[PDB]
Each structure stands twice: as C-alpha cells, then as structure tokens.
Design a binder for this molecule. Structure first.
Ligand code: 8N1
Ligand code: 8N1
Ligand code: 8N1
Ligand code: 8N1
Ligand code: IMP
Ligand code: IMP
Ligand code: IMP
Ligand code: IMP
Lengths: 342, 347, 345, 344
C-alpha cells in the first residue's frame, strides 16, 4: 500500500493563457471520436435513463455532438430508439451495451438498427468481463466502433486498446450523482485521470473521452486541454427539454429528475448513485450555445484555432481553495441571471 | 545557496485519499472477507463494534457475532456484570466475544472474571496504549494466561506496535483522536490522522507478524475499504453502530425523528473531570443486520474494483492517490437536490 | 510533440502573508510615490477601473486629486469619451487615462482622446497577449511616439516581453481575479493573481517596464501584497464602485444603501458573457475609502521597514498560509458588534 | 520578492504520541518566564483593557501564572494597579510600556510599585524604537526584567536579545480581535512563528512567549511543544469574571466586551488594526485555568514529558489537511451536553 501522488479535479486547476492570433468566433471544434467518427462539436450526452433516449440523441446530433442511448429498456426498444435516430436524416447515434448474458443479442439488434458506435459501459471497465466483451464484439463486427469504459488509469487504456477498443471512456466516481468513491473508496480525481489516460492513449493512437464531473463550460475546456477527444455530460443535459421525464413544478420553480444508473431507483441492493432533481433548463440548443461559446473563448485565450494544438499548448497551474474563491465571482450581490453562470 | 527547511510530514485521514482501480478478474460477489483478528481468532467479516457504553453490551455483541464480526463488551460496569454479559454471549451459541480491560488496581480481577466467562479476546483499552502501564499490563496478563488473546491500544506509531508486540500483545488497536465523539486532539493537541496512522502501524505490524485494528473515524463503507487496503486486519466502529436497535439506550423521538444517545467514554457523562469526549444524539438506524449488509456490500464493491479476492490481496495491491478539498467535493454527490433516501449514503 | 502539463501551484493574495522586517521607519514617514510609466509619476499607487460602473470624469477627477488616476471607460461614443477626458484635464491639470479597444475605429478614438490631452491610454482587452493588441500598440506608438500606452490584460512573463517589444510603456496584469469576473469559470483560463503579478513583475523589472496589479483586491493589505510582489500600481473596481463618485444612483433596499456594479463582459454592459451584474454597498465619498487604503499601505510598509515602494519590493518575503492560517489571519471567535472602517464581513 | 515556505498555525498540526512513563498527574508545569522569574504554570493574561487589571493579575498569579497590567490608563493608575497586586502577597505582576515620550516616567512609576517585569508592548517589536527603548530601560534599570514584542522572526529575536531583552513575545496577526494581517498584509502563522523564534531563542538563552491565536487547551500544548516558555491569551480570559467590564445579558445569554487594543474604541480612550465585540461570559478564572492545565497535563502524558523542557525536546509534529481537521474535531454527532473544555 503506497500513496502515489496528489491527483486533481477540474476545480483544482486553471489554464495559463497563451499568445493568440485567433478570435473565439474563428476557432474550430471538430474532433475525432474514433478514427472513423468525426463530431462537429466534442460533446456527448450520457447514457442514462434520465438523460438520453432518441429525443436527446437526435437533438445532440443536430447540434454536432452525439447521444448514447441507455440500455435500461428492452433490446427491442433500444434498437427501436437507435433506428428512430438513424432515420431522422443520417444523424450519428450511439447505444449502451452491458456485460450481460444477452450482450451479443443486444449488440446484434442495435447494429441491425445501424448504430454508429456502441459503448460497452460498466462501473469497472478495467475488468475481465469488459476485455473479453470487447474482443467478442470486434471478432464478430470488426468494423463496429466500440467505446469501452469506464476507466481511470493508463494501464486500463493499454489493456482495452489491446482488446480492440476504438476509444476509451474515463471516469470513476466524479459524476454529480455518483457515490462510488464514498461507498467503495475507489476512484481518481477526474482532471488527473483524463490527463494520465490521454497521455497513454496518444502513445497508442486511441482517443479518450472525459466522462463525468463537468459543471461549467470552462471545465470542458480543461478536459479537452488535458487531452480528451470529447466530453460526456449527464447533469448539464438532464434538465433540458429533450432529456426523459416530465417537468415538475414546486414553489414556482421547474425541475427534472436526475439519478445515477447505480441508484436504487434506476436498478429497480447496495447502490453507487443517488436520486434527485435538477433545475429545468429549457431547450438543449440554448445550453449547447453557452457551452460552445465558452469553449471557443477558452481556445481563443489559448491561441488554439483547432483542438489538436490545444493539448500540445496546454499549461495548467494548480490553485488553492483561496484561488478557487478568487476564480468565481466574489464580494458581489449578483442580482441578474447570467446564461452561463450560476 | 541551498537553504534549511523545516521537516514537517503531512499525515492523511480517509477523506484525504482514494483507491486507484486495478485490473479485476473478480466480481464483488466472489470475494472473501475472512480475516485473522489474531493468529488464533478468525472473523468472517472484518468488523468490530466499539467497547462503549452506548454501543456494545451483550445484545450488540451477539448480533455482531451472528453477522460474522465481533463486539467488545465495555467495562463501564461492575466486574460481575461484565462477566455476566460475556457469559450471555458465549451461551448464545458459541459466538465470539471480546471484553475491555483497563489499567486499574483491579485489572487482573476483571481479567479473571471474563476469562472464567470464556471471553475469546480481551482488549486492554486505554487512551494511550504506548505507555508503561499498558506494557506491564500486557506482560502480567500473558504471564498468567499465555493462551489468552490480548488486543492492546490505542496507539498511532510503529514504535508502539513494536513495543506492544514485544510485550506480548496478539494484536494492536490504532487510533488517537479520530473518533466522532472524541476531543483528544483538541484538548491535548495530540493525535495522528487515521489513514496514515493505520498505514504506518500496519506496515510495522506486517513485518513483525502482528495484526492491527483501525479504530475510529469511519463514516461510510468506503472508509473501511481504505482502512483495510492500508493493512488493517479489521475496522472498529462506534458511530456507525450506535444508532442500531441492538445498541444500548432507548429510542428517543423528537420532532418526527428517532434518535439514540452516543457519547465518548471520556465524556463527563460516561466518566460519571477534564474530559476528552462529548455526548450527543445520532439517527436511529434500525436493526444491525441492515447496516452490516450495506457495509459489506461496499467493501465487496471496493475489492471488485481492486481485483482483490481476499483482504490480503487487497492490501498487497492497493495504491492510493491524495485528493484536495475540491477533489473531495467531486467525490461526493454534487450539484443535485437529493430527494430519495439511499441506504448507504446520507448528507 | 509537446504534451499538456501542470506547471506549479499559483497563489492569490489570500494565500500569502508578508513577513515583518526590521523597521526604522514609522508608517507616517513612508513615501507612496510610484512611476506608472517612465514619464508618469503617481503620488499614491492606486487606479480606478475602466468600467461603466466605476470611472467617469467625476471619479477620475477625485482619484487624481487624491494622488492616483482614473481610466475613463470606452462604453460611450468617441466624442463623449473625449469630452470626459477634457473635463478632467480642465480641473487643474489632473492626470487622466482613457480606455481603447481593438476595434475598426481604434485610431479615431485614440485621436480624439489625444486631442483632449489624455495622459495615458490603456489598450484594454480580455486577452492582451494577442496579435491584435500587439499590432495595436505598434500602430499607436508609430503615430504617437510619446503617448504613454498601457496594454493588457496579461498573466505571463512571455506576454510582458511581447508587449514591451511592441512598445508598451506599462503592462496590466489580471486574467480572471475580478470580483465580477467569470472568465476562469466559463473559459477555464487564468492565473491566481499574486503569482501572476510576481512572475510578470519579475520579467518587467528585467526589461524596465512597470506592471499594474489589476483585479481581485478586497482589503488594503491585499494592495500591500501586490506592491510587495513588484506592481507599480493597483487597479480596483469593486473597492471604488460603491463610492459617491462612481457612476450610478444610490439605491435603497431594506435600510441598506447600494450601488450597481457589473463586469464589462456582462450581458448588461455589452448591451457569451464573462462577467456578472449585481450591487455592492454604498461607501460614501472616495476620500474616506482612500484614507483607509493609504493608512493600511503605510502600516504595511512600516512593518516591512520600507521607506519607499522600491525598497518594499526589494526586501519583501512572503510565506504561504493554509485555509487554517487564513481563519487565524481574520478575526475569529469574536462576535463583532461595532463597525471597523477598514474591515468588513 | 520571494515565497519562503508554507507557514502553519495551531490548527494545521498535531503532536505525535510518544512512549510515556509519566501520568498526567505526575508532570510539572513550572517554567522560566525569564532567567529570574519562574511561573508555576505557563500561562499569562493579555495586557488589554478588556482582559487584565489588578483583579485578573491577582487571580492569575494565585493560579501560578501572571497578568500584565495594560497601559490604557494614567501612569499613576497603572502604578496603583501593580501595587495592589504586589501587596496582595508578593504575587508576580507585569506592566505594559509603550514607545512614548513619557516611556521612562511610566517605567519609573511601575518600578516603584515593585513590578516584576515590564513588557515593551508594540505592534511591531522589530523596530528601532523598541530596540532603543529596551537599551534605555536596561541602562537605567539593569536588573529590571524586560519582555519586548511583538515579533515573528528569528532576526527579531536576535536584535531584541542584543538590545538586552530578557524575553521576547511572538505574535504578529494571530489575535482573535486582530486585523493586522488583513489591513497591512503582514504576519506569520503562529505555530511556525513560535517554532522559528523559540528555536532562535534557545540558541541565545532567551525565552519566547506564544502570544495570541489560542482557542483550546490543545493549542497551548502545541505552543509549548514548539518551544515557547509561556502562552499568553486574551480571548480565553476576557469572559472571566475577573476580567474588566460588566456582564451583559442579550437574549438569555451572558457576555463580556472584548476588543483589540488597536481598535477604534480602545484607541479613542485613524486606521485601526483590531475589532470590538463580545464573547461569552465564562464565570470564574479558576474554572478556566483548571481545564487549560488539565488539557496541558494530558498532552504531556501523551508525549511522555515530565517537564516542559522534555516536552519540547521530544515533540514531533505532523501536518493535517482540512479533512484531517474535520476528523480531529467531533464530527457526525449532534452534541446535546455542554462540555467544559470544548465548544464550537
Ligand atoms: C457507474 C456505476 C458506478 C454503476 C452503474 C450501474 C450499476 C452500478 C452498481 C451499483 C450495480 N455497481 C456496480 O456494478 N459495482 C461494481 C463494482 C466493482 C466491480 Cl468489479 C463491478 N463489476 C461489474 O461487472 C462487470 C464485469 O465486466 C463490470 O466490470 C462491472 O459493471 C461492479 C454502478
Ligand atoms: C479514549 C479516550 C481518549 C478516553 C477514554 C476514557 C477516559 C479518557 C480520559 C478523559 C480519562 N482521558 C485520559 O485518560 N487521558 C490520558 C491522557 C494521557 C495519558 Cl498518559 C493517559 N494515561 C492513562 O493512564 C493509563 C496508563 O497506562 C493509560 O495509558 C491512560 O488511560 C490518559 C479518555
Ligand atoms: C475583461 C473581460 C474578460 C471582458 C471585458 C469585456 C468583454 C468581454 C467579453 C465578454 C466580450 N469576452 C471576450 O472578449 N473574450 C475573449 C476571449 C478570448 C479572446 Cl482571444 C478574446 N479576444 C478579444 O479580441 C481582442 C484581440 O486582441 C483581444 O484579444 C480580446 O479583447 C476575447 C470580456
Ligand atoms: C497590536 C496591535 C497591532 C496594535 C495595538 C494598538 C494600536 C495599534 C495601531 C492600530 C495603532 N497600529 C499600529 O501601531 N501599527 C503599526 C504598524 C507599523 C509600525 Cl512600524 C508601527 N510602529 C509603531 O510605533 C512604534 C515604533 O517602535 C512601534 O514599533 C509600533 O507600535 C505600528 C496596533
Ligand atoms: O449511479 C452511478 N454511479 C456512478 N457513476 C454514474 C452513475 N450513473 C451514471 N454515472 C456516470 O456519471 C456520468 C455523469 O456525470 P455528470 O455529468 O457529472 O452528471 C455518466 O456519464 C456516467 O459515467
Ligand atoms: O471519549 C472518547 N475520547 C476519545 N476517543 C474515544 C472516546 N470514547 C471512545 N473513543 C474511541 O473512539 C472510537 C469510536 O469512534 P467512531 O467510530 O468514529 O465513533 C472508539 O472505538 C474508541 O477508540
Ligand atoms: O466582465 C468582466 N470579466 C472579467 N474581468 C472583468 C470584467 N469587467 C472588468 N473586469 C476586470 O476586473 C477588474 C476589477 O476587479 P475588482 O477590483 O476585483 O472588482 C477590472 O479592472 C478589469 O480588469
Ligand atoms: O487590536 C489589536 N490588533 C492586533 N493584535 C492585538 C490587538 N489587541 C491585542 N492584540 C494582540 O492579541 C493578543 C490576544 O489574542 P487572542 O488571545 O487570540 O485573543 C494580545 O495578547 C495581543 O498580542
């Protein structure tokens, strides 16, 4: 038993500005999710039963990103949901697969529906089940793009690449709704996790996704600058009109339900998530607009016209909790709504 | 030129660190939680209830033993009552039982009584185990009862592990200042953050062949995983069990909520003074079995994440990272209004 | 083939404290004079922010009368800004500064404030380490070789060097520390201010170019830290936005007096945002606030044995405090029942 | 301009238990305030007009410590105060002195009242005025014991000892009522200040006082283990019935006034370096001292120290994070009973 290092989350770090010749409106946000799949913006909606069904997946795709359709539904329903996305004009669609007895049956149905990428997503991606699962899928569908997760170490990146994964998803315990670190003791602060895993993925030619723990548009800039090809979000999208669930009103405020897929409610037991509510945000398009503007602003400050040189030119400093207080607005009574800050 | 620097080492508590996932070929339902409390005493689960007058009498010790762990009967009662309590556990189906002993004029009379009642382990229990009185107490007890299993505590340094081991202790108990009801660090200025204490003591124990117990400061199942991964053979809890039906004390209702009393053994109320503990209320939890179910499930999850089929394998292959207070905020659920109870998480 | 990296820990004012020095100088014996630029001297090292809720001619006149300087904001027509500079210049030859953006009409605005005899212009931008600001400085110094130019905002030594080479007479440091700023949150970018000022001032001293510590200052002691770290001057928005001389009416809500204060990057000021809009306490007249700030600075210089600001820089030593140190540093374990004029909660 | 190191306050550190052959009841709290002045317990009350006049100094001395009579009164009044303490049984008494035009005449008057020790008390002890003040006092009164302060660095210890100080007082900005670090930006977190200065004092044979920022008895143990010969407190004693000021009731709670000497109110008796407020009434000094001493004795038992010197020689600190601090305090308990040595 040894203590390796201090590991950082997004709130621990800030990016140092670079000499720039590019204005935010001039930068480009295209990214390769896999070698075969390009996205116009590097944003993905989480594969959760309170975040992404076909309604969300279609809107994400029209905005330039992609939704991963959750697997808490019949194989038949999930193929139906993937098919609904694909027939809505050649939109990209993903679907979640689990390490289950019917894994291949479910894969078979979503490929029949022409899914563009599957996510073999589990609480612990660095495992015999996932590794063998990836190898079976690629042995039957060599061309099927496969994201495998979730992981938090460079050894996991190497092992899953070696299995045939086309992309790996990073994130153990940083989710807004996640208790894995509290109930199991396990996880890696997400900025260090993405940085160390992306470094290994660059050496092997495999992209990594930064999944969970993102709250503000500036957090996405950090995750991309740390080397992720894309950022996955549940909380930021669960309050949008296109996520599942009705709008509930209470004391003049509107809400949507959001819960971990390891929460008691979603599994219906020793849960690794919680259940609750988040503010209703309106249409996804308004949220995406603010995320993309802040990302383009950060790339302007970093002198990055596109996303590759962003990682190469990224220098972080660590801030203390007093630095964090300086970074947020302070010593002001904010009386007006800001569209990208709360 | 090169300058002089003050050598101050940082020590960590459970909330300072996280376990890094390992490659895993084991599912949580396949791991084994057996542990050796002492070379002679095996537990089916690595959990102990604290020797406190608001946590463990015979009712709790019986339930802990039936769940696969052990309870330590507290000594805030007559010698005859403590022997009766141990005896009641031992008559309830050969269950394991422990009893707390103090550095007192009547120490051996109390030891004799609980030995007569067939106690399986005594805990020579003190605020400062790395002391002349505890060292001599262990020697005297082992000279009279060479086969009697003795835990000695509490301590926080490898030197204390070495000295108590040389005195004849079969196991040592680590924890100066981490307990939820404890003020030792505040009033005396003394203690060691518990994750570092357990790690540094356990590593010395591993080299001497003596196990160590991680006593105090545990709040969530994941904290126990950290303590076991750091090398502790078992985890001792007061607060986590004190709200259970099987703990001493009536269930008290106030403004629609149910409470039980929990207090330090060094608080005024327990000692009845310069106290080193406080007295208060915690939420009623219901039956011990439901709390144990959640704790065990969390430990098994952690071992799955670390690929550990056994607790020795957990310790041998565990790596930690340090998190900052921002890391801690990410680790807990954040930016959500939690609306439903979770059986293993409360804020 | 470079890779992303974590360079170091960087500190804000609340992270550090100045170690007392042997002193042979009482606080009333110290001199607060400073060179804003080689050409311009200030009797006290304080500047009011170039914002439409902080500085117009009323504030700039009062700042200059106190011995500092105000920068007239550019959220107005070119003609009105020229008029505002002119009102300041007329009142006894007081120093005045004016804000300029990287815009298509940049040189037209410069022309008009030069005509009004502005003493310094600030090429004010969110990201001063940029081609636009560099080319802007060069163009201005080509048409007006002796016009003093401050360029900002920046946070790195590289930026100091690049703007000095472009011809800047002074550089302004601050990416993200402002009270009303959200740059670090929405874009992910910035450098904690004490470290940003120390590292930029270190480069500036090597090149003979001063640097301004802009943003994030809350108490008079924070200004001492900024000056000890090598800044020639401190610029404040929040500390001045509540004064009588700031723009905006005095608003009363539930027995408390307020004034509006907002980021220039806020939706309201621009009518994707990087600032917020709110209200701060009304503080009465600028003179009362400056008195407390100056007294605090003089006290600090007494503690550090510094008769002059250059001596303060040369002999200042900092320690880092933890959040527990910070709790010690503030009053603690006391129910404060009387207002202190230089301390609020 | 450079960052030297991280500096720590009491809440940043904990003492590691030692092997112990001494029980808390077997330890000795005796200490040398100066080479000439022994205290039976290592505690002093602050020279503040809401903490120490003759009533508090007499009570402090009878408990084995010492009070420093504040100077916010006429020279004649301060002499009478000192005189009351000395006539109450040869009790030890101290008196504060400022860097003032009447400095020597104030010293003359308290010397005639037979003060045991004067404290050349100032915001910045590492200054020419204090250095020359000490030299002048020791020139006229070579045997008069002189504490000089306040300071926060080893260099200040050296310069003050060279001036002739018999003891130096450490604390720039730790006071509960102090705003020095906020308004002037200056100070050193108190545990590091005491450790650095006391180590310098030990080399020179000059003791150092840990003055300010103490909240709990364990904070004093840390100050003494860091090498301080004594601890000085305002807040911990200002609520005692022997402190100046009436007991005031507000909404069923009892309070006394407590304020910095550099607050407006105290200076009026303007850029201040302190605040004014109220703290809880604590009853008689004896009950507070009893808890402080018990906690110190417990700490010394944990460290196996029969004496304050052995405590310093064998003390090892570790640093704790804010998560460590949350563990060190009681946590996850609704406290429902008063404890005499713990509040929050
Ligand atoms: C994202 C998270 C948090 C999540 C999502 C759904 C359910 C769970 C539950 C609550 C069921 N928690 C769990 O599942 N915890 C766990 C712990 C350790 C291990 Cl080793 C495994 N292993 C599983 O078996 C598969 C083998 O490939 C795959 O690795 C994993 O899903 C699972 C967690
Ligand atoms: C778990 C704790 C906190 C506890 C439990 C019950 C009582 C106390 C009290 C409040 C009485 N606090 C105390 O007891 N504090 C103390 C401090 C330092 C020393 Cl050295 C000792 N030594 C005692 O005498 C024995 C000699 O072996 C044994 O070491 C110890 O119990 C005791 C503390
Ligand atoms: C002080 C700040 C925060 C501020 C003040 C007013 C408006 C803005 C807005 C909200 C408009 N935010 C912005 O302006 N964000 C931004 C981001 C990245 C870059 Cl690269 C640039 N570049 C601009 O174009 C100029 C070219 O030199 C100069 O670099 C900059 O002013 C601007 C920000
Ligand atoms: C304990 C403190 C905080 C205190 C107590 C009373 C008054 C003050 C006031 C508010 C008046 N604040 C002050 O006094 N601040 C100060 C700052 C810097 C220097 Cl250099 C000095 N020097 C003074 O003049 C003497 C010359 O030796 C001696 O050094 C010092 O007392 C004083 C502070
Ligand atoms: O219950 C769970 N426990 C732990 N992690 C979860 C759970 N459900 C979803 N996740 C992860 O949390 C991410 C969402 O994090 P968020 O964007 O911070 O809300 C998802 O994309 C999953 O990777
Ligand atoms: O009053 C006391 N002061 C300090 N520690 C105590 C006291 N009473 C019990 N303990 C310790 O605290 C542990 C319980 O800690 P908890 O599980 O955090 O509530 C016990 O097992 C003892 O080691
Ligand atoms: O909206 C904005 N976003 C970021 N920084 C701003 C904005 N508006 C003004 N600033 C900066 O914030 C400073 C004022 O900071 P303050 O003194 O902390 O309130 C100004 O002098 C500018 O450098
Ligand atoms: O107004 C002031 N400003 C700064 N320090 C003060 C002031 N008045 C008293 N002190 C110091 O604060 C100490 C008391 O600190 P406390 O024990 O934390 O309340 C005194 O002994 C003085 O050293």
């Amino acid at each position: 038993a040894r203590i390796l290092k201090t590991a950082y989350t997004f709130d621990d770090v800030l990016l140092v500005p670079n000499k720039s010749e590019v204005l935010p409106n001039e930068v480009s946000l295209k990214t390769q999710l896999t070698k075969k799949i390009q996205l116009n913006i590097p944003l993905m909606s989480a594969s959760m039963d309170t975040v992404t069904e076909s309604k969300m997946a279609i809107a994400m795709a029209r905005e330039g990103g992609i939704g991963i359709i959750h697997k808490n539904m019949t194989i038949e329903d999930q193929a139906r949901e993937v098919d609904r996305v694909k027939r809505s004009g050649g939109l990209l669609c993903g679907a979640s697969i689990g390490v289950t007895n019917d894994m291949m049956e479910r894969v078979d149905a979503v490929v029949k529906a022409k899914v563009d990428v599957i996510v073999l997503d589990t609480a612990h991606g660095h495992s015999k089940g996932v590794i063998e699962g990836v190898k079976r899928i690629k042995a039957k569908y060599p061309e099927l793009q496969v994201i495998a997760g979730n992981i938090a170490t460079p050894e996991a990146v190497r092992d899953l690449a070696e299995a045939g994964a086309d992309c790996v998803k990073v994130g153990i315990g940083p989710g807004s709704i996640c208790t894995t670190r509290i109930v199991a003791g396990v996880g890696v602060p997400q900025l260090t996790a993405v940085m160390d895993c992306a470094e290994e993925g660059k050496k092997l030619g495999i992209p990594v996704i930064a999944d969970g723990g993102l709250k503000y548009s500036g957090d996405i800039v950090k995750a991309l600058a740390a080397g992720a090809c894309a950022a996955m979000m549940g909380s930021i999208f669960a309050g949008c009109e296109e996520a599942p669930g009705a709008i509930e009103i209470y004391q003049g405020r509107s809400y949507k339900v959001y819960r971990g897929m390891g929460s008691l409610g979603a599994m219906a037991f020793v849960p690794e998530g919680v259940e609750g509510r988040i503010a209703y945000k309106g249409h996804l398009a308004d949220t995406i607009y603010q995320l993309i503007g802040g990302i383009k602003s950060g790339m302007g400050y970093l002198g990055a016209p596109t996303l590759e040189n962003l990682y190469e030119n990224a220098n972080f400093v660590v801030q203390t909790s007093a630095g964090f207080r300086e970074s947020h607005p302070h010593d002001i009574n904010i009386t007006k709504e800001a569209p990208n800050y709360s």
